């Protein structure tokens, strides 16, 4: 069974047809205005019109700003890319920060392109170079084509192939008893190995045998693949070929990220524009979620400045939980959320408030039920009171150890004694800080 | 061309054992499967 | 319905500077309104750059936040044209772990001076009828063949040497194909298979698209125009068979001797009349972020005879320069500050803010009532213009949610209540002093 | 007499966590004394780890120096035992020069998640005796020999070619996997180690294989997720597993690894076993790295973090802010602090006894009394270290039992922190730099 995470219950915002926020739906309670704003943002993302618009979820720690981003991701679906990030990913020892940011920005934009695969594959039986019976002046014969018999688990059939393919057949080891495959579009031939049927004619053979193919000899299907715009960058930056001393040399050396030049993007954009205009590929913009933005640098913010007004950048959702803090990279330039004011004028701020005890108890119950835990009301109320005394996280965290203690005692549900014992055992931040202050002389 | 295949795969020489031939013995030269059938063939000869 | 890679951004409505033949800015043209003096100066410098005779000229644009400095930059970039190189670099796009700051600035400078080359070649576009290959038995590896080409009017037979045969085999060209042959270099570009020749076919050995037959004469002339920056010429000549560094960006701290060699060779190329050198424009935005060493390198690098017309941008006041402790205007030392002209921008008013909102709505295809426009302008005067611009899309979405067609004051008030401003967020922020982190 | 690579350390006298069936600690069991509440919490979180149902859980152990945070962590590791990954690192181990602090923590996270897989293996292994070929498709046979049988295989042409290229000779012990057909020479038999009086560049003499020849069975493989990441990091990445040459693995590979692992667990092919990541002296991590743990503990697959901290209210490294435990508040709430308590005099006697029997040292009762007095007036670790020197000084006296005089002599010879500091101030001018 899939293991329980810390945000497993969040399945959506839980909105009406009119956009109003339900009191409790899809694992979310409260924060009605925030949920309505997030629904508006979801509509904006689905609109496929804007670009580079940013929203900043601002609120105290443990108020659900991280959860709402995942709710937006869930309500978006899975056909639109959603790239998470923390503020500490920019600091790399291999490449500059504004390239980490540019690569991530290009990650949140995905493609979706369709194509057909056609192949003739199966076991080879005989090779008949069918001749035309009347050689030409100055020659003893005139081979017309090659007849190749291929059999799979369905049936056997003969195919007429160009004579030149024989020149490729001798390039590899094409003997009867092997299984081969030829790409219809490409036209090359490749050998997989001898069939399993002849796996017993010897006691020790150096080659490994593959099973006989099941299905029709000639397969043809249609496949749609999705690639982000960053994958094209890496593919074009590092050509993966083997017939070079450069390709192979780089493929032997330690791979390192390289600062992609803006000229490469200028041509990838042109080619994807051409193919979109030809109706082959469909572009789908996505979302990029930066949590703990307050860990960025002033250089990173100043690059984000220019990055946002681009006509290609995706929708960015920032999250932070800092008060009036000093901006990283400066000396004493304080600012709200640790974010410069000039950048902060380009974002739409969504405020997240605290949680009332009723909503806290509802959250505790939802977590307990999603987790597969049974709790009594006289203990659930005590747990909610304890959480309201300290915080929501400290109340939700004690669910599992209480269940383990009850199961050790044999009971199938948590009572008052289990909760009080667990609370007596573990400590919270406030009491630990009080102890540290009391015993400061011995640390 | 297609060389003619064989119908039944070779079997362990001991009539009781129905396993296929993993290998052939050296001292006496018969098909064998494992330790037990090797010991049986050694004893019965 | 289809969505291209280019979407509607923050400066997607500005299509130019909106100036007449007399270089007198208009009140409202080409997506730009107001800011008459800055637009005038920008038109002057645009005409100056278009003339392209003096080098190493710098211009700084200063003013309040959100007063169109970047808007002016994008406007002059659009007015300049696509064929004139323009490079936009942020203030932090030079602090790299792969090359020094001076090296990055040198690459940025050399990336702006373009070279235009017209390349005319003789080509043969035609349909393949049959191909003749006569492999030797033993001999010494000499191959001989013939190749017949046909169009809807004329046809011919060509002989083959020992060089194009290997190319034809590598590209795997057979009958029923339409190919373009480059007479100079010798490359074979594949167009596609024909229609009539596809009737006689073996099993699928090539499945792809379809094309027609090149009409007219078999032999023609093709012309390409290449715009190559100096920096990529430097990268090409810095190592043998090194071309992925144009895209990979792996070349670091190129040797100077290569740079002077390229400068000299470009000089002779200009003299011979083969290629044409065209200076471009470099736009460094938020340039207060540059370390003092970068500024002082700019000092000397701006005195060369191949420097571009760099354009600055800053919204800071009397601030200490990055990396130092000395105050100075615009966070820039006086040395660099004494070598360029400074263009200042004025804060906006109500009359032109309303027109900004109107043109933004026209770009975004959003309709509001006149009362809604007045409320939005009041918001965009009590609060910055960017917030009012942003609220337009949210109001349009909210209006479309209720199956509406015209945005109303109630929708705008709802959006104002839903999202937040920096001032209101800070006001609500003071009441949770102990709830936040590190106050 | 014979000393192995491992010997008596500081935490080697503890073997598991002393508990009961009802998770009730004992006064003195499995080399642990006291810390009843801390051991109860440790047992609860150990059961939580063993169940492995919830992901992303953090526990912090705090207390004064010399109270046994690291001892509790090692006891937990021993009680958990092998077969469950347990990655123990120090706080300062992530300050690398080839990878950022993010990668050095991401890899430390992926190295505490185990994957159990089952494989069907058939392998032949034995000493070759004679190889015969003919020259007519060359046909031949080869003979294997073990302690039980002696057998002949009628191998094919490709096997002939492989054997010729590998240059197999009689007396060699070789293994072949019939599934693929790869020869893995192990060396030469002991009985074949005399026909050459000048051995080549590299040869090894190993005993002839015993038992049945062609063994077919099922094996279990427990591989960490970090290994699966490194293997797909580059073309030949398994070298980096031992070299340590890996750096900044692309994020488009770890997601694929996670998706494939989820698909495998859905198919039942492989099973995921969570583990523990112990980060000792976590009080010295970067504010940038602390913020990374915020989103690292909220993933579907993540180990249980256990941290130790010796700091009270102190400055955070990387910023000019005062916080408890040197840890930001936005992370401390995600944790679950388990506090410790300074030991009493009875605990001090009962803890010096265990080390004495660990070092195989007999001590007198008055010697124990004096040692307990010293270890109460001074640090416990100093008193613990005072027994090893005492044994050697008593051995120099040619006595089998230590006494009070020996303890006093060893106390007078070496110095503790207090006396060193006191004597240091007497002639502080002679010292350098204050
Ligand atoms: N609206 C909500 N409904 C249900 N649970 C919530 C809600 N908001 C927060 N939580 C719970 O609070 C816990 C921590 O919230 P989090 O998103 O980490 O807050 P922050 O982002 O401020 O740190 C999560 O485990 C989540 O389950
Ligand atoms: N004169 C103008 N004409 C049209 N739009 C303008 C003008 N001035 C400002 N704007 C709009 O204001 C928005 C913010 O301006 P911005 O580029 O941030 O100014 P600055 O870069 O000086 O802070 C831009 O999206 C732009 O469309
Ligand atoms: N509960 C205990 N039982 C037995 N020995 C202990 C216990 N706690 C600590 N010790 C011993 O005390 C010595 C020092 O304790 P240590 O773990 O270094 O303290 P801290 O946790 O402050 O680092 C260790 O060598 C350890 O073996
Ligand atoms: Zn048998």
- Helix/strand-derived category of chain B reads alpha+beta
Most extensive interface: pair and counts? A-C, 85 and 72 residues
State the total count of DSSP E strands of chain B: 2
What radius of gyration of chain B results from the CA coordinates? 13 Å
Largest sheet of chain A: 7 strands, antiparallel
Helix share, percent of chain A: 25-40%
Q: Summarize the biggest pleated sheet of chain B.
A: 2 strands, antiparallel
What is the fold's blueprint, element by element?
This is part of a larger assembly, with one copy of chain A (443 residues), one copy of chain B (45 residues) and two copies of chain C.
Chain A: E1 24-25, E2 28-29, H1 32-47, E3 54-58, H2 65-76, E4 82-86, H3 97-107, E5 109-128, E6 131-132, E7 142-143, E8 146-151, E9 156-161, H4 164-169, E10 178-183, E11 189-194, E12 218-225, H5 229-237, H6 245-252, H7 262-277, E13 281-285, E14 287-291, H8 298-308, E15 315-320, E16 324-326, E17 334-336, H9 341-344, E18 347-351, H10 357-371, H11 377-390, H12 392-397, H13 399-409, H14 416-425, H15 429-438
Parallel strand pairs in A: 3-15, 3-18, 4-14, 14-15
Antiparallel strand pairs in A: 1-2, 5-8, 5-10, 5-12, 5-13, 6-7, 8-9, 10-11, 16-17
Chain B: E1 23-25, E2 31-32, H1 35-44
Antiparallel strand pairs in B: 1-2
Chain C: E1 28-29, E2 32-33, H1 36-51, E3 58-62, H2 69-80, E4 86-90, H3 101-110, E5 114-134, E6 144-150, E7 155-160, H4 164-171, E8 177-182, E9 188-193, E10 219-229, H5 230-238, H6 245-248, H7 256-272, E11 276-278, E12 281-285, H8 292-301, E13 309-314, E14 319-320, E15 327-328, H9 334-337, E16 340-344, H10 350-364, H11 370-382, H12 385-401, H13 409-418, H14 422-429
Parallel strand pairs in C: 3-13, 3-16, 4-12, 12-13
Antiparallel strand pairs in C: 1-2, 5-6, 5-8, 5-10, 5-11, 6-7, 8-9, 14-15
Bound molecules: adenosine-5'-diphosphate (3 copies) and zinc ion.
């Amino acid at each position: 069974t899939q293991r329980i995470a810390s945000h497993s219950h969040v399945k959506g915002l839980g909105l009406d047809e009119s956009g109003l926020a339900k009191q409790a739906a899809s694992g979310l309670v409260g924060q009605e205005n925030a949920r309505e704003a997030c629904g508006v943002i979801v509509e904006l993302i689905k609109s496929k019109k804007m670009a580079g618009r940013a929203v900043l979820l601002a609120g105290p720690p443990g108020t659900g700003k991280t959860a709402l981003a995942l709710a937006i991701a869930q309500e978006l679906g899975s056909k639109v890319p959603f790239c998470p990030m923390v503020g500490s990913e920019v600091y790399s020892t291999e490449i500059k920060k504004t390239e980490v940011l540019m690569e991530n920005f290009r990650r949140a934009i995905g493609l979706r392109i369709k194509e057909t695969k056609e192949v003739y594959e199966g076991e080879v039986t005989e090779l008949t170079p069918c001749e035309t019976e009347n050689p030409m002046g100055g020659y003893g014969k005139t081979i017309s084509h090659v007849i190749i018999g291929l059999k799979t688990a369905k049936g056997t059939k003969q195919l007429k192939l160009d004579p030149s393919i024989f020149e490729s057949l001798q390039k590899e080891r094409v003997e009867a008893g092997d299984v081969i495959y030829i790409e219809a579009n490409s036209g090359a031939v490749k050998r997989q190995g001898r069939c399993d049927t002849y796996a017993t004619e010897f006691d020790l053979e150096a080659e490994e045998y593959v099973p006989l193919p099941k299905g029709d000899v000639h397969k043809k299907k249609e496949i749609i693949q999705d690639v982000t715009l960053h994958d094209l960058d890496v593919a074009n930056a590092r050509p993966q070929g083997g017939q070079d001393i450069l390709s192979m040399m780089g493929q032997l050396m330690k791979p390192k990220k390289t600062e992609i030049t803006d000229k490469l993007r200028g041509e990838i954009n042109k080619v994807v524009n051409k193919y979109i205009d030809q109706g082959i590929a469909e572009l789908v913009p996505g979302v990029l979620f930066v949590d703990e933005v307050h860990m960025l640098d002033i250089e990173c913010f100043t690059y984000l400045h220019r990055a946002l007004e681009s006509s290609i950048a995706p929708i960015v959702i920032f999250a932070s939980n800092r008060g009036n803090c000093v901006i990283r990279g400066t000396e004493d330039i304080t600012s709200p959320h640790g974010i410069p004011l000039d950048l902060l004028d380009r974002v739409m701020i969504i405020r997240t408030m605290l949680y009332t005890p009723q909503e806290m108890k509802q959250i505790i119950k939802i977590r307990a039920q999603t987790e597969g835990i049974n709790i009594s009301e006289e203990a659930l109320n005590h747990l909610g009171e304890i959480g309201t005394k300290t915080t929501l996280r400290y109340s939700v965290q004690l669910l599992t150890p209480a269940n383990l203690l009850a199961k050790i005692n044999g009971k199938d549900s948590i009572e008052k004694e289990h909760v009080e014992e667990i609370s007596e055992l573990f400590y919270d931040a406030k009491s630990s800080a009080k102890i540290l202050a009391d015993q400061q002389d011995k640390y | 061309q297609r060389p003619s295949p064989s119908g039944p795969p070779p079997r362990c020489s001991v009539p009781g054992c129905p396993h296929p031939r993993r290998y052939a013995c050296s001292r006496t030269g018969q098909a064998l499967c494992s330790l037990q059938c090797y010991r049986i063939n050694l004893q019965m000869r | 319905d289809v969505t291209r890679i280019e979407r509607i951004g923050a400066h997607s409505h500005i299509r130019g500077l909106g100036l007449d033949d007399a270089l007198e800015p208009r009140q409202a043209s080409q997506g730009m309104v107001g800011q008459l003096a800055a637009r005038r100066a920008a038109g002057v410098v645009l005409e100056m750059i278009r003339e392209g005779k003096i080098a190493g000229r710098a211009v700084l644009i200063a003013g309040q936040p959100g007063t169109g400095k970047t808007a002016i930059a994008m406007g002059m970039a659009q007015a300049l044209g696509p064929d004139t190189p323009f490079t936009a670099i942020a203030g932090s796009e030079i602090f790299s772990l792969e090359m020094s700051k001076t090296e990055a600035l040198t690459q940025a400078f050399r990336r702006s001076i373009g070279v235009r080359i017209k390349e005319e070649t003789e080509i043969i576009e035609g349909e393949v009828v049959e191909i003749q290959i006569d492999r030797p038995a033993t001999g010494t590896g000499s191959k001989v063949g013939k190749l017949t080409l046909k169009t809807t009017e004329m046809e011919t037979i060509y002989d083959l040497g020992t060089k194009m045969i290997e190319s034809l085999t590598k590209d795997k060209v057979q009958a029923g194909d339409v190919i373009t042959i480059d007479k100079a270099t010798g490359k074979i570009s594949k167009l596609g298979r024909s229609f009539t020749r596809a009737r006689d076919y073996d099993a699928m050995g090539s499945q792809t698209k379809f094309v027609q037959c090149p009409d007219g004469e078999l032999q023609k002339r093709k012309e390409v125009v290449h715009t190559v920056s100096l920096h990529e010429i430097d990268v090409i000549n810095s190592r043998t068979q090194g071309f992925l560094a144009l895209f990979s960006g792996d070349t670091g701290e190129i040797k100077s001797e290569v740079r002077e060699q390229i400068n000299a060779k470009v000089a002779e190329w200009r003299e011979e009349g083969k290629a044409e050198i065209i200076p471009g424009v470099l736009f460094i935005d938020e340039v207060h972020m540059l370390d003092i060493e970068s500024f002082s390198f700019l000092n000397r690098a701006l005195e060369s005879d191949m420097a571009p017309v760099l354009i600055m941008a800053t919204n800071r006041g009397i601030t200490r320069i990055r990396g130092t402790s000395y105050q100075s205007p615009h966070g820039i030392p006086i040395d660099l500050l004494d070598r360029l002209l400074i263009v200042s921008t004025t804060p906006y008013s109500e009359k032109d803010t309303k027109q900004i909102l109107r043109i933004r709505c026209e770009e975004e295809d959003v309709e509001m009532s006149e009362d809604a426009y007045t409320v939005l302008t009041r918001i965009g005067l009590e609060t910055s213009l960017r917030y009012a611009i942003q609220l337009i899309t949210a109001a349009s979405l909210v209006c479309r949610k209720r199956k509406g067609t015209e945005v109303q004051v109630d929708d705008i008030k709802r959006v104002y209540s839903l999202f937040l401003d920096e001032s209101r967020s800070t006001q609500y922020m003071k009441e949770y002093q102990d709830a936040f982190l590190f106050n």
